[PDB]
Amino acid sequence: STRGDLIRILGEIEEKMNELKMDGFNPDIILFGREAYNFLSNLLKKEMEEEGPFTHVSNIKIEILEELGGDAVVIDSKVLGLVPGAAKRIKIIK
Amino acid sequence: STRGDLIRILGEIEEKMNELKMDGFNPDIILFGREAYNFLSNLLKKEMEEEGPFTHVSNIKIEILEELGGDAVVIDSKVLGLVPGAAKRIKIIK
Secondary structure, three states, X not given: OHHHHHHHHHHHHHHHHHHXXXXXXXXXXXXXXXXXXXXXXXXXXXXXXXXXXXXXEOOEEEEEOXXXXXXXXXXXXXXXXXXXXXXXXXXXXX | OHHHHHHHHHHHHHHHHHHHHHOOOOOOEEEEOHHXXXXXXXXXXXXXXXXXXXXXXXXXXXEEOHHHOOEEEEEOOOOOOXXXXXEEEEEOOO
16 A cells, blocks of 8 residues: 555654654754655655655655665754764665 | 865865774765865866866765755765764865
């Protein structure tokens, strides 16, 4: 069920956002692999019945990092590389 | 001296690459902010007397994450978001 897939993905992003916030981070961006982005884009085109492109999800900004493949990484971009733990990975593709 | 600036930047990237390798990571990508990328691009156009665009530095792949501003972040993209410490930030702009 593509609706279930969208509910799952929104739920996992929210969970990683919450995990980061609890640690003192401010999640601002989610990096998507090429395959991950295509997967979510297809889902949102189908579900929203809109053409895209899609630039935000879960109140944060989508940016592409092609090499992440079927995964995405929620980050606090202000402290990424200065404080360990500023990144949380999730698997987007089935 | 723009040559000195290039020597500095290559030296800082190498240092963060080495720091990551010593920790067990495999640095594969360096994320550049918009201002950081422009700065390095201008330097390399001047020094290499080539037009660009520039896609690799220090044996790793350049990818843009616009929001990093005048900074760049060396990452191990395979474990980013799974193991803390997979990212090291550097300040590119003067």
